[PDB]
Each structure stands twice: as C-alpha cells, then as structure tokens.
Structure 1
Amino acid sequence: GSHMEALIPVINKLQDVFNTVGADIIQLPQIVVVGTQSSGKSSVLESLVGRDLLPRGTGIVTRRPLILQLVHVSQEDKREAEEWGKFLHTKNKLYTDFDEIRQEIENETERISGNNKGVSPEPIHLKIFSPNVVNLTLVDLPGMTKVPVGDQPKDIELQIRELILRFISNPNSIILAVTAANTDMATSEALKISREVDPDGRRTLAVITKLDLMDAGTDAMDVLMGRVIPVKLGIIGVVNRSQLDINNKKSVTDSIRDEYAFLQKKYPSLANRNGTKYLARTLNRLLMHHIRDCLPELKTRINVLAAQYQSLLNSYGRRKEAADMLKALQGASQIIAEIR
C-alpha cells in the first residue's frame, strides 16, 4: 500500500532489526526524548502510555535507552486483556501485568555494561498494545542532572551527555526537549545540549512540564505563545503526576482529567493546543510526516549501504559483522519496497 499509517510500523521493524552500530549508520527517522531527571520526562512517557510503567528507582546501575513503541488496537483484540506488552529480548512472551513489565525494564537496566560504566547505548525494545494509546514511537534517553555553576560534572553525567549526543547527532532524529516550567528555561539543559547538533531548533520540539508548579507572579504565557524558546517544531505545555501523586499511587488517567481541568481554568486561550491528548496526537502526526519526508533518503542510503556491504563481503572471499549487516539491510530494503 501507499498508507501514511504504514510508516511508523515500518520504522518500528527497522528499530528491532539493527544493533546500536547499525542504527547509527542507517540514521532512522525517530523521536529522541532529551531532559533532566527532574524535568518529569518519565511522567510525560507514562502520560502517553496512559498508565505507570517505568521503574521508580533511586539510581540506575546501567542507564540505557528505552525504544517505546505504542500501537493503537480495537477493544475486540483481547489476549482477556485490552492492553499488553512485548520486549524484543523476550521474543513473543506477552505481558498482561504492567507491574511485570516495569520489573522487566528494571531487570534490563541491572545488566552490567560490556565496559565499566553506568551508561550503555544498548536500548531496551518495548512495544505496548492498547486502545488508549495513539500510534507513536519514542527513544527515551537517560535523564541529565543540571550541574550548579562551579560544581565539577561527575563522570556518569559526562557519559549520559555523550550518549545523548550519540543519538541526537542522527540528522533524522527529532529532539523532544523536556523542561520543567518551574526552572530557568533560557538555561534548560535539554535546550543547551540540543543546540550542539540543532542550533536553530529546526528539528527540536519543546515540552514544558509542571505548569501548575510555577513560582507565584510568573506564568507560561510567553513560552506557550511561542515568543521565548528558539525551537521551530512547536511548544506544548503539560501537567503530569507530581512525585507526591506517584508516591500516593494517583492513576495517570486521573492526572490527565486534572490536567485538562487546570488548563481550562488557568489557560483557556491555550487549552486546545496543550495537554496530554494534544501532545499525543501532535507527536503521532509529526512522526508520520517526518518518516514520509525521510523515506526516499532512507531507501536510497539502505540500497547504497547494501551494495557497499555486499562489496566489502565479496572482498573477503569481521566477516560476521559485514554479513549480519548486509542481511539486515536486504530485509530493510524489501520492507521499504512494500510501500508505494
């Protein structure tokens, strides 16, 4: 078919097929989530999933990317359960218990790295099927910590920043920069590190969290009217669960009802272009458009790489790297050709 609706599932397959080195070479069209731990980055993800999912962990032994693939289903595809998960690493094991899914994410972050570091580029590959999600994939990267002017940035913090730079240097990456509204957004760590690859914010969309927790005598009006933050793909404000709400087991679904009430109350002029449902629809539309726009460049580069890996492999008579890569490119090429 020619469907815009087939584009996300196609890149979903290429994300499963390529290892981290392969993925760097292919430059896939995808959204990379960049923020501080204190940005509420995690609560943005859970808000799009429609329930809690991520390890509530003080510190992570080995911080890794999460490739989170959200798939919309009808209420009549029940496994019975209307919502379930799969990981690439547990093949076709279906997960109906979301606590079990969270534990499996924690388990995978407890693997010691191939090196001796608290960061690894090896992503956790998780797919969620649900009637309550839009069709959307996000590559969530380990959160930064803002280093107070004069403090010495820790080794682990430099490693988290190198990993972010590795992912967002993908020219076909869209950067979802997350910043709390209760912080100096001019000095956002998310926006600073994004400018190291995207100086004019051409491929950067800003999410502002914690609109409710702003210092009294300040508001988000200027930012949400698009007059402050230099990015080009849009500014969306959200109100997620506070660290209190989480500790109190407040549901994501109820946090969203309370978010819409707040926006309608305080920001009625802006409510229809902000909040969780609008972010979800916006990101779905943006990713579909981005993949459509990148697909011919992707198809070309996949065919040129196949020819180049075929040629290197023929040159031999190391060979395992080349051979696996060539096999993965040949599959990628066939999957892309099934479109128009």
Structure 2
Amino acid sequence: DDNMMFITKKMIEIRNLLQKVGQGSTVTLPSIVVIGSQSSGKSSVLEAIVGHEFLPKGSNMITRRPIELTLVNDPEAKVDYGEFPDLGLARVTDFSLIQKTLTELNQSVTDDPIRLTIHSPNIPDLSLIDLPGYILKRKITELCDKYIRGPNIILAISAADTDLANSTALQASRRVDPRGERTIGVITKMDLVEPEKGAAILSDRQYPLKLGYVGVISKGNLLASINRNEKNYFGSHPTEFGPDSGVSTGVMTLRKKLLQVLEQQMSSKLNETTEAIQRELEETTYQFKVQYNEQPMSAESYLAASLDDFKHQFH
C-alpha cells in the first residue's frame, strides 16, 4: 500500500517547491493546521510529539512563530534524524539538540514560520503546521484566524476536562468551518475519565463533522511504548471503546485517517494550483524573451566576452 504513502510524499515535496519559487508565488498547496486552547494547547503539543517520536516541545513556548513540519517515509533508514532547511545539509541525531536549537529560536522570536524535516521509519509522511494555541493574545488570535480561513485541513484537539463548547479550538474550528467538512477533532487527556466519559466525548451529536473525532492519551523506544499503552489501556474498559464500538482511538487509526484526508484535499487543490503555475511559467517565459532574447547565459560566458575585449584594447 506503498503507492499510497507515495502520492503524498510527491505532493509534499511539490508544496515545498511552490512555497520556495519566488515573489509572486502567492500560490500553494494546503496542509494540516493544529489549534488548541491552553489545557487543550498542552494536549495538542503532547500529541504532536507523540504522533511520531519525542521532540522538543512545550515547557515555555512564546508560540509567536509557526513550525511547518514536513515528514518523510523512512523505510531503508535506520536512524531517527531531523534536519532544518535553512540550516541546510545538517543532520541532527538526538532531539535534545533539536530542543536547544528550536527553543532558542523560540526565545528569539517577522512572523516567519520555521520549516522542519524529520525522517523516521515508524512515522508516515505528513505535512502539519503548529501555530501558537489560544490563551497580545489578540495578536496571536489574529494569526490563528488568518491561517484557519484558507482551505487547509484544520483542526483541533480538546482536553477531556473542559466542556467541548468551552474550548476555543473546536469553537474557532466551527467559526471558520460551519459545515465541519475540512476539520478533524481529537480528545486528549482521556486517561483520567470514565468510559461513559469517552463515549460521550469521542462520539457526540452536539457538534457533528465529517472525519469524526479521535480520542487518545499521549504521553528509549518511546514510540512503541506509547503504542503499547494504547493497545493495553482500552482493555481496562474494552467494550466502552474498542472494536465495533462507534468511537475510534489510538494513534495509528488517527494517522491513517490523516493520510486519507491529506491525499484527498490536496488532490482537489491540484488543478487550480497547476493552471496557476502554467500562467506564471508563461509570464516568466515571456519576460525571458523581452528581456535578454531568451538566450541561455552563464556568468563565465559574460566574463569571457569582456576579458576578450579588454586584451585587444590593451594591445
């Protein structure tokens, strides 16, 4: 089902190349945006870390700049390693170093969002961005709202202790998405609630959406262990949230859903985006004629013609 992960990785690389083309490359492909209120914002950070592998997160985060995570299927690679594009060609083995570096970027604080790239075999390639969660506060909200508007596959996490209505995350998710078509929900911190409790949250009708909600508890060999606990815990109250139950939970199903949504939405945006690139290629090509007669040029060919003219003059 390899062909499958692959469509996404090809698109993610293409998302990067649109992002990098140039000034008028207003054009881009969508991606996952992640919002969460404070307890919920903490649940969301935890979750992002947990989805793949431990990474520097939380503690004290100014949350002023977004972090564009781009993941890569890492089969044939046996070392968990993450690299920064602006810090090009550098690979980082231990995430503690990635803690020091990105969190000092966190204390430096333009609004530009740092790009990131991590390769790990258990992780499926994705393209999520983590912006600061809701708690000056106005200005953070302002960025959040602007990012949510555009058709990115958004959404939300919500801690089990808070009422669903009370949480800003799902509340803005509903504000910018009335239909709930492009937004997925996650109920975190679910470990300390009765199974009656998971049932009412994991499945609700007060606020229905497509792609459903996903409940999970996130928090060496940490991956597998977080997996182990999810496999182990539901056994406590299996009938309340397990097979054939309407709710869905644990990190893996939530991930494959993420794969599906991302492949589908991106694929919708591909047409309009592509005609856009053909229009900007035609603009660049036409300017290439009016300016410099479309001839290929290198700096050495320029340098040769002058040097030559100078020697005959000097003679």
Pair in the same fold by TM > 0.5: yes
Which of 168, 181, 189 is the matching residue for 1:210? 189
Is residue 300 from structure 1 mapped to residue 275 from structure 2 by the alignment? yes
1:139 deviation in Å? 1.0
Larger C-alpha radius of gyration, 1 or 2?
2
CA contact (8 A) 1:55 1:105 kept: no
Runs of 4+ off more than 4 Å: 19-24, 305-311
Is residue 90 from structure 1 mapped to residue 91 from structure 2 by the alignment? no
1:209 deviation in Å? 0.5
Alignment-mate amino acid for residue 16 of structure 2: D
Which of 145, 154, 158 is the matching residue for 1:179? 158
**Aligned partners of 1:45 and 1:290: how far apart in 2?**
21
Alignment-mate amino acid for residue 204 of structure 1: T
| Residue 162 to residue 224, structure 1, CA distance change in 2 (3 Å) | same
After TM superposition, list the pairs within 5 Å mapping 1:13-52 onto structure 2.
13-17=13-17, 18=19, 25-39=26-40, 40-50=43-53, 52=54
1:170 deviation in Å? 1.5
1:254 match: secondary structure: helix
Is residue 188 from structure 1 mapped to residue 188 from structure 2 by the alignment? no
CA contact (8 A) 2:56 2:96 kept: no
CA contact (8 A) 2:155 2:170 kept: no
Which of 102, 106, 123 is the matching residue for 1:133? 123
After TM superposition, list the pairs within 5 Å mapping 1:1-340 onto structure 2.
4-17=4-17, 18=19, 25-39=26-40, 40-50=43-53, 52-60=54-62, 63-74=64-75, 76-78=76-78, 82-112=79-109, 114=110, 120=111, 122-145=112-135, 155=136, 157-171=137-151, 173-214=152-193, 219-241=197-219, 251-268=222-239, 270-272=241-243, 273-307=248-282
Q: Structure 2: 5+ residue runs without aligned partners?
A: 292-315
CA contact (8 A) 1:55 1:103 kept: no
Superposed CA offset, 1:298-335 (max 9, x none):
21233235556778x68x97xxxxxxxxxxxxxxxxxx
**How many correspondences in the alignment?**
282
1:280 deviation in Å? 1.4
Which segment drifts farther, 9-18 or 100-109? Answer: 9-18
| Residue 307 to residue 264, structure 1, CA distance change in 2 (3 Å) | farther
**Aligned partners of 1:27 and 1:125: how far apart in 2?**
15
Alignment-mate amino acid for residue 265 of structure 1: S
| Residue 302 to residue 227, structure 1, CA distance change in 2 (3 Å) | same
1:166 deviation in Å? 1.7
**Aligned partners of 1:211 and 1:34: how far apart in 2?**
18
Superposed CA offset, 1:134-178 (max 9, x none):
122211111112xxxxxxxxx2x111111111211112x011211
| Residue 197 to residue 226, structure 1, CA distance change in 2 (3 Å) | same
CA contact (8 A) 1:16 1:88 kept: no
Name the Cα RMSD after superposition: 3.0
Alignment-mate amino acid for residue 181 of structure 2: R
1:56 deviation in Å? 3.9
CA contact (8 A) 1:205 1:235 kept: yes
**Aligned partners of 1:140 and 1:33: how far apart in 2?**
5
1:250 deviation in Å? 10
CA contact (8 A) 2:45 2:58 kept: no
CA contact (8 A) 1:84 1:128 kept: yes
Q: Structure 1: 5+ residue runs without aligned partners?
A: 115-119, 146-154, 242-248, 318-340
